[PDB]
Amino acid sequence: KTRVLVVGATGYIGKRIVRACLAEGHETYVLQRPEIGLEIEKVQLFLSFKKLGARIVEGSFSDHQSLVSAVKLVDVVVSAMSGVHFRSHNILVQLKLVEAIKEAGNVKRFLPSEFGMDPPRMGHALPPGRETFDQKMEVRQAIEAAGIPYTYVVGACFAAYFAGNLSQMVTLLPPKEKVNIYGDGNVKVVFADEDDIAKYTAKTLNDPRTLNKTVNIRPPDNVLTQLELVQIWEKLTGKELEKTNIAAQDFLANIEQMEIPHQAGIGHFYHIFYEGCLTDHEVGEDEEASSLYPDVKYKRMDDYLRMFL
Amino acid sequence: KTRVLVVGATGYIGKRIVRACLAEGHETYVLQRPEIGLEIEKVQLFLSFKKLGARIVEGSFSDHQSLVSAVKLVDVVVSAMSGVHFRSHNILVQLKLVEAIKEAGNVKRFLPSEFGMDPPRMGHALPPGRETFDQKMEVRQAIEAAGIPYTYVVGACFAAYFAGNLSQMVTLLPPKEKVNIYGDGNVKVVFADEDDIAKYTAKTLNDPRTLNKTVNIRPPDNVLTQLELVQIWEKLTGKELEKTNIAAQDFLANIEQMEIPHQAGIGHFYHIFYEGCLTDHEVGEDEEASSLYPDVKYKRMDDYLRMFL
Ligand SMILES: NC(=O)C1=CN([C@@H]2O[C@H](COP(=O)(O)OP(=O)(O)OC[C@H]3O[C@@H](n4cnc5c(N)ncnc54)[C@H](OP(=O)(O)O)[C@@H]3O)[C@@H](O)[C@H]2O)C=CC1
Ligand SMILES: NC(=O)C1=CN([C@@H]2O[C@H](COP(=O)(O)OP(=O)(O)OC[C@H]3O[C@@H](n4cnc5c(N)ncnc54)[C@H](OP(=O)(O)O)[C@@H]3O)[C@@H](O)[C@H]2O)C=CC1
Ligand SMILES: COc1cc([C@@H]2OC[C@@H]3[C@H]2CO[C@H]3c2ccc(O)c(OC)c2)ccc1O
Ligand SMILES: COc1cc([C@@H]2OC[C@@H]3[C@H]2CO[C@H]3c2ccc(O)c(OC)c2)ccc1O
């Protein structure tokens, strides 16, 4: 019944948002941009979205009128535009979609590509990693400057990037024998299975309680320190890892000499694991996903980590 | 009971071979290399394989003994090494895998990364695209010099790359109004759904009738000229396309000025659509997959194209 267009449909979180939308019963449309020519994996993703009942909608960010038509077909727009330097970081491209929405005037709600650290709260962050927050704030201000009703989904680390690897930067698998603990390891971090983030997204986009609101993904059982997450892994394996504590001064040493994308990752990690930006402020139950949607039975970090045994 | 090691598990056809091996009931092992630590999509394929019952085996082509130890665990090795210029063309890396298979001595059969044009018949092929057939023949010669038992799966155009686009290059979708036709369009081409290719592969690797044989994938109902292919789409859509014929001399014009991966593609199309190298020779029923495995209800091109509607 609610019509939803997903932009960034074949992206990491986007393809999950698409599926979650179909599973929730939204009439679901996905923007197929024509610039994806020989990218066979994207094409076949679109093919499989259609098999499950998504509706292809052709459009391009180089064709302002195509964006206008596209968003004219739906009540809700969800953007999953890319925003990670080691992949690509085109948050600002959404500006064109905001103004398409402005001109079209039918969109009851817009969800921009947030799904992470809360932008309004990273004003102190260090470049280059800060470009993320600023660009999202740039889009937030364009949304509000056009009066577009909105929901911002913030709050949780993607489990695949921060849990499955015990928060080590070199990899996405657990370490064999040795692990680095950032600082004392006693700073709470919020972890969420990406399928849960998508599930909450699909449940909130037409929840009246989240209209013009920031929704936090902070499921209580998944608020864990890094030493706590490493300890779940040690339990699951019955083996203790050699832990080296890394001080902030050492984690940042010679950052100036590193490639810009890695500097940005280091900056993001710094804010999460040394400053604790995801848990350094409180949020009530009228703005937290697992409390707004208690039937969602979110995966806990131990079952997430069990897949890696 | 047949234990297969798939090298190239996450590749385009490789991941399809992984799942076909599982569905066929082979005890299925997949080589997970440590170099792919930060490619999220590959890491999560390995997880998805695991959940299906595949067995993870760690090994690197930069660690000869890891390869030896890898191939020691299985009866059959299937290689799906990359070999397309606009993706990756590393056929010759298999030579190290061949060395390992030689040293290990237990392997009952090897399937090298073939799955296309039949290399020994591409003697007179145009550079740079000729690179593909020369590297596969250099690999073939190491397999036989080393007395390794083999099966070569050849003969079919991947349907995604030649059928879902009506054989239009540099796109993967059917054109909306106009189609180019190479020559008169009456040269017979062989098309196969890549899942049928993987299923035949999984079925042939423990088939006594195909030990040390070339196996052609030439499903008779999918032996089509390009015009017949185009006419199937026209009947699905109910819309006639405006057809422009393109002579060999204009298709090949100024080839030397092309990005050399496009030179490789041009040459490959030329051999397929202009010289009919996939249909210029007959093959017996004792060496053709649909005839060896009639229980496989292979997808025809009308059922294939219904996905693009
Ligand atoms: N731990 C956390 O909390 C994390 C948060 N995030 C955030 O998730 C959001 C999405 O991240 P992620 O899923 O990796 O993004 P992706 O790299 O996966 O890209 C998503 C989509 O962006 C579209 N895209 C990329 N470039 C362009 C372009 N020039 N023009 C139009 N469309 C483009 C593409 O859409 P199309 O499908 O049309 O091709 C692509 O599929 C980001 O804000 C990111 O910061 C992501 C990582 C972790
Ligand atoms: N119409 C036709 O007949 C077609 C035929 N083909 C043929 O199919 C075969 C597979 O092609 P395709 O599926 O596109 O292959 P891909 O390009 O998708 O790559 C397959 C695998 O090759 C592995 N790989 C790549 N580089 C290396 C490397 N340096 N060292 C070790 N492993 C590497 C990777 O394995 P890993 O997953 O472990 O990381 C990769 O996943 C090729 O011979 C191709 O020539 C391909 C296109 C069309
Ligand atoms: C938790 O908030 C965010 C998370 C990220 C995800 O941390 C920045 C990124 C990212 C995932 O890719 C993370 C990252 C960057 C560099 C790395 O080496 C890395 O290794 C796992 C992981 C992106 C933006 C955010 O606001
Ligand atoms: C059919 O046998 C083969 C086909 C190929 C096909 O053509 C080169 C590739 C593989 C897939 O990609 C085809 C391709 C090349 C260039 C293009 O522009 C293209 O557009 C669809 C498609 C490669 C090796 C083969 O043995």
Q: A255-291: b or e for each residue (b if 16 or more CB lie within 10 Å)?
A: eeeeeeeebbbbbbbbbbbbebbbbeeeeeeebbbbe
User: Is there a single domain that holds both residue A225 and residue A267?
Assistant: yes
Q: Within 13 Å, how many C-alpha atoms sit on residue A92's CB side? A: 6
Smallest CA–CA distance, residue A47 to chain B, in Å, is 7
- The answer to whether the Cβ–Cβ distance between B38 and A308 falls below 8 Å is no
Q: Are A163 and A305 in contact (CB under 8 A)?
A: yes
The tokens for A161 are 């990037």
Which one of the listed residues A50, A72, A102, A136 is annotated catalytic?
Answer: A136
* Amino acid at residue number A197: I
User: Is there a single domain that holds both residue A277 and residue A138?
Assistant: no
Smallest CA–CA distance, residue A161 to chain B, in Å, is 8
HEC letters along A209-241: HHCCEEEECCCHHHEEEHHHHHHHHHHHHCCCC
The tokens for B209 are 């009738």
The tokens for A299 are 């995966």
Residues with Cβ within 8 Å of B254's Cβ and at least 6 positions away in sequence, in order, are none
- CB of residue A86 inside a 6 A radius of ligand 3: yes
Ligand 4 centre from B131 Cα, in Å?
13
Ligand 3 centre from A129 Cα, in Å?
10
CA A139 from centroid of its chain's CA atoms: 16
Using alpha carbons only, what angle is made at residue B268 by residues B264 and B272, rounded to the nearest 5 degrees?
A: 170
Report the alpha-carbon distance of residue B131 to residue B91 in Å, rounded: 10
What is the helix (H) or strand (E) element at residue A47, kind and residue range? helix A40-51
Instruction: Give pairs for A92-97: CB < 8 Å, separation 24+.
Output: A92/A135, A92/A138, A92/A139, A93/A61, A94/A7, A94/A139, A95/A138, A95/A139, A95/A142, A96/A61, A96/A64, A96/A67, A97/A7, A97/A61, A97/A67, A97/A71
**Residue that has been written with the tokens 């962050």 in this structure:** A125
Q: Are B140 and B152 in contact (CB under 8 A)?
A: yes
Which one of the listed residues B136, B199, B203, B299 is annotated catalytic?
Answer: B136
User: Is there a single domain that holds both residue B165 and residue B212?
Assistant: no
Q: For residue A51, how many other CB atoms are within 10 A of its CB?
A: 9
Binding positions of A are 10, 12-13, 33, 42, 82-83, 87, 90, 113-114, 117, 136, 158, 169-170
- CB of residue B265 inside a 6 A radius of ligand 4: yes
User: Is there a single domain that holds both residue B112 and residue B245?
Assistant: no
- The answer to whether the Cβ–Cβ distance between B307 and A47 falls below 8 Å is yes
Burial grade of B44 (CB within 10 A; 0-12, 13-18, 19 or more):
middle
- CB of residue A161 inside a 6 A radius of ligand 3: yes
Residues with Cβ within 8 Å of A230's Cβ and at least 6 positions away in sequence, in order, are A166, A179, A181, A185, A241, A243
User: Is there a single domain that holds both residue B258 and residue B271?
Assistant: yes
What is the domain range of residue A118? 1-154+194-216+282-293
User: Is there a single domain that holds both residue A134 and residue A225?
Assistant: no
Beta strands across the sheet bearing A3-7: A55-58, A27-32, A3-7, A76-79, A109-111
- The answer to whether the Cβ–Cβ distance between A38 and B172 falls below 8 Å is yes
**Residue that has been written with the tokens 């267009």 in this structure:** A5
Q: Identify the three-state secondary structure at position B133.
A: helix
Report the alpha-carbon distance of residue B75 to residue A224 in Å, rounded: 45
Q: Are B137 and B119 in contact (CB under 8 A)?
A: yes
Q: Identify the three-state secondary structure at position B229.
A: helix
User: Is there a single domain that holds both residue A257 and residue A181?
Assistant: yes
Phi, psi (degrees; rounded to nearest 5) at A286:
-80, 5
CA A271 from centroid of its chain's CA atoms: 16
A136 counts as catalytic: yes
Report the alpha-carbon distance of residue A235 to residue B295 in Å, rounded: 48
Report the alpha-carbon distance of residue A113 to residue A154 in Å, rounded: 10
Report the alpha-carbon distance of residue A249 to residue A234 in Å, rounded: 27
- CB of residue B13 inside a 6 A radius of ligand 4: no
Give the count of domains, chain A: 2
**Minimal-distance CA residue to ligand 3 atom 23:** A84
Q: Are B206 and B215 in contact (CB under 8 A)?
A: no
**How many inter-chain contacts (A to B, CB under 8 Å) are there?**
41
For this PDB entry, the determination method is X-ray
The tokens for A301 are 């970090």
Comparing C-alpha atoms, which of B279, B285, B271, B300 is closest to residue B190?
A: B279
Report the alpha-carbon distance of residue A258 to residue A237 in Å, rounded: 34
- The secondary structure of residue A30, as a DSSP letter, is E
- The 3-state DSSP composition of chain B as helix, strand, coil percent (nearest 5) reads 45, 20, 40
User: Is there a single domain that holds both residue A104 and residue A127?
Assistant: yes
Q: Which of B6, B7, B10, B13 to mutate to test the pocket of ligand 2 (most atoms within 8 A of CB)?
A: B13
- CB of residue A11 inside a 6 A radius of ligand 1: yes
Which residues is B88 bridged to in the sheet?
Answer: B84
Phi, psi (degrees; rounded to nearest 5) at A262:
-70, -40
Smallest CA–CA distance, residue B105 to chain A, in Å, is 30
Closest ligand 1 atom to A13 CA: 13
Beta strands across the sheet bearing B188-192: B157-158, B188-192, B223-225
- The answer to whether the Cβ–Cβ distance between B161 and A50 falls below 8 Å is no
- The answer to whether the Cβ–Cβ distance between B38 and A173 falls below 8 Å is no
Comparing C-alpha atoms, which of A138, A77, A142 is closest to residue A106?
A: A77
User: Is there a single domain that holds both residue B163 and residue B177?
Assistant: yes
Phi, psi (degrees; rounded to nearest 5) at A292:
-70, -25
* Amino acid at residue number A309: L
Q: What distance, in Å, lies between the first and last C-alpha atoms of chain B? A: 41
Beta strands across the sheet bearing A223-225: A157-158, A188-192, A223-225
Q: A53-66: b or e for each residue (b if 16 or more CB lie within 10 Å)?
A: ebeebebbbebeeb
**Minimal-distance CA residue to ligand 3 atom 12:** A161
- CB of residue A43 inside a 6 A radius of ligand 1: no
CA distance to A15, A182, B42, B69, per residue, from B33 (Å): 26, 27, 10, 13
User: Is there a single domain that holds both residue A138 and residue A231?
Assistant: no
Taking only Cα atoms into account, the Rg of chain B, rounded to an integer number of angstroms, comes to: 20
User: Is there a single domain that holds both residue B44 and residue B69?
Assistant: yes
- The 3-state DSSP composition of chain A as helix, strand, coil percent (nearest 5) reads 45, 20, 40
Within an 8 Å CB–CB cutoff, is residue A309 touching chain B? no
Report the alpha-carbon distance of residue B109 to residue B174 in Å, rounded: 39
Report the alpha-carbon distance of residue A121 to residue A133 in Å, rounded: 9
Q: Identify the three-state secondary structure at position A6.
A: strand
User: Is there a single domain that holds both residue B211 and residue B263?
Assistant: no
HEC letters along A74-130: CCEEEECCCCECCCECCHHHHHHHHHHHHHHCCCCEEECCCCECCHHHCCCCCCCCH
**Minimal-distance CA residue to ligand 4 atom 20:** B169
